[PDB]
């Protein structure tokens, strides 16, 4: 019903779009279809091109000097729109036909087909001293009136609309996570065991994650403390493959397990942005201009192993740690940690409308 339009600064060029969020169904992305309303009496033997660009901005091993944090272009597409010189008989979107009928004979359609294995819109949380465009993956539709593509893109006759590539939680739940550990301590038989396991494979934002930790320390060592953490990983293959990591939820429990005894408990954690608004580089969901978005959703890679091209791959894991105190030769402070990691999926369920209903002050 409703469409999005944005005219050029001088008003002699408008771009109409149906959606600003284009869902990726893994197999195929939704096509970025739309129309451009031009003024042939103003072009004066000049063409109109529409470009779609996926841009990656990040600094390779970011430090006090950010050298590589300028820009990158993971995908660029071009379409000549006003003069139908290619005579492209590609089928028109019903939205395109309706907009053409409404606008008249000067409205010409454009349509893109974003290839799969492309990054979703991910925003890296800026630091308190990070001045500039936020790092991450960003899509944009740009239409301009120029004689040729190589000509300078004048500011006045150009329209830049930001769009988002998004994913949603798959309708088929995965197997319930479960991990184990059996650490045989030095000079001690009957080793310690850990059997942490979640309850769901897929979680939604704002929902609690229940961890079913079951310890059985059949050894002669005492578990001093139990640390439970939810961490976010963000692989960034911009200049070199570099996996990052950041906890988002933590729950340090003081429960202790005596030697030759078991311990069963269920914990509960919920990642949210209120207590993480200061972790620089935290992967957030794609923003339009500056509004608040939740923690970034898990990246659903196509076919598991298709191609590792550049982009940010967001994943989440639950870490279950058992610290074991040790004295004697030590000073009762050298703790051996037994760790378990459980991967889970953090996505949005499939919606019925455009996500942005949030009231703005």
């Amino acid at each position: 019903t409703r469409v999005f339009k944005k005219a050029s600064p001088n008003g002699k060029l408008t771009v109409y779009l149906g959606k600003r969020d284009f869902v990726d169904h893994i197999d195929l992305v939704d096509p970025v279809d739309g129309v451009v309303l031009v003024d042939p009496e103003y072009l004066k033997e000049r063409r109109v091109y529409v470009t779609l660009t996926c841009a990656f901005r990040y600094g390779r091993e970011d430090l006090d000097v950010l050298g590589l944090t300028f820009r990158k272009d993971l995908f660029v597409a071009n379409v000549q729109s006003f003069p139908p010189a290619p005579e492209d008989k590609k089928p028109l979107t019903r939205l395109q036909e309706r907009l053409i009928k409404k606008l008249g004979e000067h409205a010409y359609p454009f349509t893109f087909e974003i290839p799969p294995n492309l990054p979703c819109s991910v925003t890296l949380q800026p630091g308190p001293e990070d001045t500039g465009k936020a790092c991450g993956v960003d899509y944009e539709v740009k239409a301009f009136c120029a004689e040729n593509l190589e000509e300078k893109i004048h500011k006045r006759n150009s329209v830049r609309l930001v769009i988002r590539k998004v994913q949603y939680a798959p309708e088929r739940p995965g197997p319930q996570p479960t991990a184990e550990t059996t650490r045989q301590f030095l000079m001690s038989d009957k080793p310690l065991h850990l059997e942490a396991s979640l309850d769901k494979e897929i979680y939604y934002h704002g929902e609690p994650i229940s961890v079913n930790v079951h310890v059985t320390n059949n050894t002669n060592k005492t578990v001093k403390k139990i640390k439970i953490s939810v961490r976010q990983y963000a692989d960034i293959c911009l200049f070199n493959t570099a996996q990052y990591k950041c906890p988002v939820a933590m729950e340090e429990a003081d429960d202790t397990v005596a030697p030759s005894s078991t311990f069963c408990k269920v914990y509960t954690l919920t990642p949210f942005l209120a207590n993480n608004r200061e972790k620089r580089g935290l992967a957030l969901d794609g923003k339009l201009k500056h509004e608040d978005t939740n923690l970034a959703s898990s990246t659903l890679l196509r076919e598991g192993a298709n191609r590792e091209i550049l982009g940010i791959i967001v994943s989440y894991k639950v870490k279950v740690k058992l610290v074991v105190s040790r004295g004697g030769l030590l000073g009762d402070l050298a703790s051996s940690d037994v760790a378990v990691e459980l991967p889970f999926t953090l996505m949005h369920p499939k919606p019925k409308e455009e996500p942005p209903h949030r009231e703005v002050p």
Epitope: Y204, G206, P208, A274, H348, P351, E359, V360, P361
Partner: antibody, heavy 120, light 110 residues
């Protein structure tokens, strides 16, 4: 089952204070927003306050901003509305309403409401 | 927007069982389609009818239907049943001061 239960609403004096408790059940404070909507006797609805609890927002009306404060207790899944400096124009039935945190702001769940009478 | 006023046109509405009635409201400025409709029986909490100015909330009878033309919004009831006697409210939620309408009382006429 989803239900919001109110408590702590009763007769007070013009200058007193109460603390309304909304025992939210069936959902979580992080995946939903909690709102306070009051209805004066014989009048229309008026939104008073709201708390996000995911982004850490608290919002207040232009008439209750200084005096009303909203908070949530995550462990007990209970939202709290501490009233202060209550005047005569605060006699109303206060409902705690729930909204989706992600991609909806429309109050699909309401409580029964607590009649808060503020008179000397 | 500093503050948005929702103006419900029918303050009082008299109808009969099986009749078709429409309740409309006009926003002060463009709230986009961020509009919801609520039904309140005497002595109870409001019930959400529709949202997004058209989307029919799950469980609501199909008689209720909303639409948006411009800055104005409309809630229509087709073949209203006797239990449609209530007060209907419109809400905008495009801005933090979410504003409600004054309400429309649909009374049964005879």
């Amino acid at each position: 089952e989803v239900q919001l239960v109110e408590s702590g609403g009763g007769l007070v004096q013009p200058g007193g204070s109460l603390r309304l408790s909304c025992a939210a059940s069936g959902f979580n404070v992080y995946s939903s927003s909690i709102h306070w909507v009051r209805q004066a006797p014989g009048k229309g609805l008026e939104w008073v306050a709201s708390i996000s609890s995911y982004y850490g927002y608290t919002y207040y009306a232009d008439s209750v901003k200084g005096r009303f404060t909203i908070s949530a207790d995550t462990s007990k899944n209970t939202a709290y509305l501490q009233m202060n400096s209550l005047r005569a124009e605060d006699t109303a039935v206060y409902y705690c309403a729930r909204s989706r945190q992600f991609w909806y702001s429309g109050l699909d769940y309401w409580g029964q409401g607590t009649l808060v009478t503020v008179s000397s | 927007a500093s503050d948005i006023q929702m103006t419900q046109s029918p303050s009082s509405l008299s109808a009969s069982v099986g009749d078709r009635v429409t309740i409309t409201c006009r926003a002060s400025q463009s709230v986009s389609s961020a509009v919801a409709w609520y039904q309140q029986k005497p002595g109870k909490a409001p019930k959400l009818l529709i949202y997004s100015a058209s989307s029919l909330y799950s469980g609501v009878p199909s008689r209720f239907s909303g639409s948006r033309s411009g800055t104005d919004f409309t809630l229509t009831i087709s073949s209203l049943q006797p239990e449609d006697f209530a007060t209907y409210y419109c809400q905008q939620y495009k801005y933090v001061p979410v504003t409600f309408g004054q309400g429309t009382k649909v009374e049964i006429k005879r």
